[PDB]
Amino acid sequence: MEKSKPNVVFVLGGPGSGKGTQCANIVRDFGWVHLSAGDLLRQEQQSGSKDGEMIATMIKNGEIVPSIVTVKLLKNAIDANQGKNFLVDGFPRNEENNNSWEENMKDFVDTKFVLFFDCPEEVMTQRLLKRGESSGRSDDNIESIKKRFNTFNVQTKLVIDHYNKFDKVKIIPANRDVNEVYNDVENLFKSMGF
Ligand SMILES: Nc1ncnc2c1ncn2[C@@H]1O[C@H](COP(=O)(O)OP(=O)(O)O)[C@@H](O)[C@H]1O
């Protein structure tokens, strides 16, 4: 008769590994709320806050924005959606992200696991150049794309390694057709009781 705290699943994977694509399917079939941290950041810069032109520059360069900004945006969205569960997509991307989540949120949510989509960089590059023909995203060009790989490699893989220490990573290989990947995603969420 108390309201349950939201379940949260971090969704990680390289740029273009299919996080946003698979999250939309989970929203559709499970009724979770999909929060793409990168999306929220693109919105925050959209209508031009203080932090707006900082976010533009860092996104173009594949850099991780200060966590005070990102975690605030996530927390606001989450607080606006009482009684829902959340797919937190593309976060945490480094140790600062994770610590700031822990400090702001751990009292408020049950973060269940990291869903990690494993994909070859070569395949990710091709998807992103394809997405780049119509996305109008400032980071879907080869210069940005390789900077995004280095950030993922240097900062993000350590976070995924951290969660795997505690058995909190579910890996779904993503180098297949989108329905073959989703079949596995949908089976995973069902087996996890969602
Ligand atoms: N399994 C897949 N096979 C081929 N294309 C895919 C697959 N998953 C997603 N895509 C395409 O790859 C691009 C990147 O997908 P997206 O979900 O935006 O990635 P992410 O959020 O991980 O950066 C999009 O054009 C998307 O339609």
Ligand SMILES: Nc1ccn([C@@H]2O[C@H](COP(=O)(O)O)[C@@H](O)[C@H]2O)c(=O)n1
């Ligand atoms: N936790 C996060 C998530 C996204 N980002 C920024 O948004 C950019 C785009 O992220 P997405 O590909 O997940 O939309 C990232 O490359 C990075 O510059 C961030 O700075 N912090």
Ligand SMILES: [Mg+2]
């Ligand atoms: Mg995305």
